[PDB]
Scaffold this motif. Structure first.
Motif, short mmCIF file in Angstrom:
data_model
loop_
_atom_site.label_atom_id
_atom_site.label_comp_id
_atom_site.label_asym_id
_atom_site.label_seq_id
_atom_site.Cartn_x
_atom_site.Cartn_y
_atom_site.Cartn_z
N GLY A 167 46.36 86.13 8.50
CA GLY A 167 45.85 85.11 9.48
C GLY A 167 44.27 85.18 9.34
O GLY A 167 43.51 84.62 9.70
N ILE A 168 43.84 86.42 9.19
CA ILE A 168 42.42 86.84 9.26
C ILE A 168 41.45 86.05 8.11
O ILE A 168 40.48 85.91 7.93
N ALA A 169 42.43 85.72 7.12
CA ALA A 169 41.90 85.12 5.77
C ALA A 169 40.74 84.09 5.87
O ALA A 169 39.58 84.26 5.45
N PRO A 170 40.86 82.82 6.67
CA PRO A 170 39.85 81.85 6.86
C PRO A 170 38.85 82.54 7.38
O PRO A 170 37.63 81.78 7.36
N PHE A 171 38.71 83.41 8.67
CA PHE A 171 37.87 83.91 9.24
C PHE A 171 36.84 84.81 8.46
O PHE A 171 35.71 84.94 8.58
N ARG A 172 37.50 85.40 7.46
CA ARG A 172 36.57 86.22 6.62
C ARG A 172 35.85 85.44 5.73
O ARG A 172 34.61 85.49 5.47
N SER A 173 36.37 84.14 5.46
CA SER A 173 35.72 83.18 4.52
C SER A 173 34.57 82.46 5.44
O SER A 173 33.38 82.54 4.92
N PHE A 174 34.80 82.25 6.75
CA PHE A 174 33.51 81.70 7.67
C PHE A 174 32.49 82.52 7.91
O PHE A 174 31.33 82.25 7.83
N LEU A 175 33.10 83.61 8.18
CA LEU A 175 32.04 84.91 8.48
C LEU A 175 31.20 85.44 7.38
O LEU A 175 30.00 85.54 7.41
N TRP A 176 31.69 85.12 6.12
CA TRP A 176 30.78 85.59 4.91
C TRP A 176 29.68 84.42 4.69
O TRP A 176 28.56 84.83 4.53
N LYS A 177 30.07 83.33 4.97
CA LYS A 177 28.93 82.06 5.12
C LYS A 177 28.09 82.24 6.11
O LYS A 177 26.76 81.93 5.79
N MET A 178 28.53 82.74 7.39
CA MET A 178 27.68 82.90 8.39
C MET A 178 26.84 84.23 8.43
O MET A 178 25.68 83.91 8.82
N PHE A 179 27.20 85.25 8.07
CA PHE A 179 26.66 86.50 8.21
C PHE A 179 26.32 87.27 6.57
O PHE A 179 25.21 88.01 6.81
N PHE A 180 26.79 86.75 5.75
CA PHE A 180 26.60 87.47 4.36
C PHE A 180 25.78 86.47 3.41
O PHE A 180 25.51 87.00 2.23
N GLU A 181 25.39 85.48 3.83
CA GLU A 181 24.60 84.47 3.05
C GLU A 181 23.74 83.60 3.54
O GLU A 181 23.69 83.36 4.81
N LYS A 182 22.59 83.34 2.98
CA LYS A 182 21.48 82.66 3.15
C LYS A 182 21.47 81.18 2.62
O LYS A 182 21.40 81.05 1.64
N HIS A 183 22.01 80.26 3.60
CA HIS A 183 22.13 78.88 3.30
C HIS A 183 20.84 78.13 3.73
O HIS A 183 20.70 78.06 4.78
#
Ligand SMILES: Cc1cc2nc3c(=O)[nH]c(=O)nc-3n(C[C@H](O)[C@H](O)[C@H](O)COP(=O)(O)OP(=O)(O)OC[C@H]3O[C@@H](n4cnc5c(N)ncnc54)[C@H](O)[C@@H]3O)c2cc1C
Ligand SMILES: NC(=O)C1=CN([C@@H]2O[C@H](COP(=O)(O)OP(=O)(O)OC[C@H]3O[C@@H](n4cnc5c(N)ncnc54)[C@H](OP(=O)(O)O)[C@@H]3O)[C@@H](O)[C@H]2O)C=CC1
Length: 308
Positions: A167-183
């Motif tokens: 169930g961690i799956a969508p949260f890894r998705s959210f977090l990448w956009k939040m902390f591993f990417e510059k949008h």
């Protein structure tokens, strides 16, 4: 006079990132055919079960966003010579994905193995097909699907993520956009608090990635693991997700009263009850009825659940 403004359909207001969202582009009838780029076991050889991270090429054909799922039609036939029905899997990659090019999709899959009453060892069809997938092989993809776990539009909102196992799956998705990417249009500055329940240390999904994020956003990224078969509270109770949340009861309740707080829950169907037990007490002591308060939150798009 060649124009007119056709009266607008009445529509509900949404706080979640749903602008130009796409669901059900590909049907199981004619699924998009992608390929496996990599497939790695992310849990220790010692863990009770195996969880695999896999990435498939989409050549940008599947327009998914954080929080959605995709269906997979596993190869083969059932006992009646019929093709398998699709199984849904939560997307574990952000929209731009693990390669940063918007042309791949990632899944976090638990290999289902159990034994029936007859004492026979049974292997889940789709999960074993996926965990056995070799790089280079094709995979049939359907969707995207889902709108319940879409991220909030507010880049300064508090996002509380509650997950068990895969169930961690969508949260890894959210977090990448939040902390591993510059949008450009989205730079996260709120508080992201993640709680993850897993059975053992050898089962800590994406531990290293989450640690890098903590080391990169030490203020606004909070991480709490609940290792059920290794940790215990003062009374000797197994550290399930709600048992860990209990240690931050005061803080969570305080955040839950804030109007820019969004809660997301994903994973085991049973996690839902222990969490409510915890919440009913807090609200009670605060002279509040969780039953009614939760209803409000849900209607306000602030208590989002996707369990099974
Ligand atoms: C929206 C959604 C998203 C999902 N996302 C993910 C995800 O990201 N990762 C993930 O791992 N899974 C996810 N799942 C579950 C996934 O769709 C499959 O159900 C799972 O992979 C098992 O399917 P299978 O084909 O392997 O098993 P199947 O061949 O379908 O077998 C499952 C059946 O076996 C029986 N069974 C299952 N477990 C046991 C047990 N322990 N003991 C006895 N009998 C049992 C039940 O009758 C069950 O119907 C998600 C589910 C939904 C609805
Ligand atoms: N979008 C969706 O709907 C998704 C749904 N899922 C569902 O979650 C499943 C994945 O499970 P898997 O990864 O194997 O997880 P597990 O069986 O590995 O266990 C997850 C952890 O949660 C604990 N746990 C078990 N029951 C509860 C409970 N009632 N309350 C709180 N914690 C509990 C377990 O403790 P212990 O083992 O010690 O009992 C374990 O530590 C999928 O099969 C799917 O059905 C997964 C992803 C997405």
């Amino acid at each position: 006079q060649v124009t007119t403004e056709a009266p607008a359909k009445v529509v509900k207001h949404s706080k979640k990132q749903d602008e130009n969202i796409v669901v059900n582009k590909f049907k199981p009838k004619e699924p998009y055919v992608g390929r496996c780029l990599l497939n790695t076991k992310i849990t220790g050889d010692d863990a009770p079960g195996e969880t695999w991270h896999m990435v498939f090429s989409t050549e940008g054909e599947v327009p998914y966003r954080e929080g959605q799922s995709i269906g997979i039609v596993p190869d083969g036939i059932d006992k009646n010579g019929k093709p398998h029905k699709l199984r849904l899997y939560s997307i574990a990659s952000s929209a731009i994905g693990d390669f940063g090019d918007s042309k791949t999709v990632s899944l976090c899959v638990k290999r289902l193995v159990y034994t029936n009453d007859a004492g026979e060892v049974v292997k889940g069809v789709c999960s074993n097909f996926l965990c056995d997938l070799k790089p280079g092989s094709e995979v049939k993809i359907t969707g995207p699907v889902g709108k319940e776990m879409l991220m909030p539009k507010d880049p300064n909102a508090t996002v509380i993520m509650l997950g068990t196992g895969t169930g961690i799956a969508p949260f890894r998705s959210f977090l990448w956009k939040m902390f591993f990417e510059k949008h450009e249009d989205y730079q996260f500055n709120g508080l992201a608090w993640l709680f993850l329940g897993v059975p053992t240390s050898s089962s800590l999904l994406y531990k290293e990635e989450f640690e890098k994020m903590k080391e990169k956003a030490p203020e606004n990224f909070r991480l709490d693991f609940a290792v059920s078969r290794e940790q215990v509270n003062d009374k000797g109770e197994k550290m399930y997700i709600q048992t860990r949340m209990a240690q931050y009861a005061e803080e969570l309740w305080e955040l839950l009263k804030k109007d820019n707080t969004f809660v997301y829950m994903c994973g085991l169907k049973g996690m839902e009850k222990g969490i409510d037990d915890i919440m009913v007490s807090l609200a009670a002591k605060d002279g509040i009825d969780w039953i009614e308060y939760k209803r409000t939150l849900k209607k306000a798009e602030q208590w989002n659940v996707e369990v099974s």
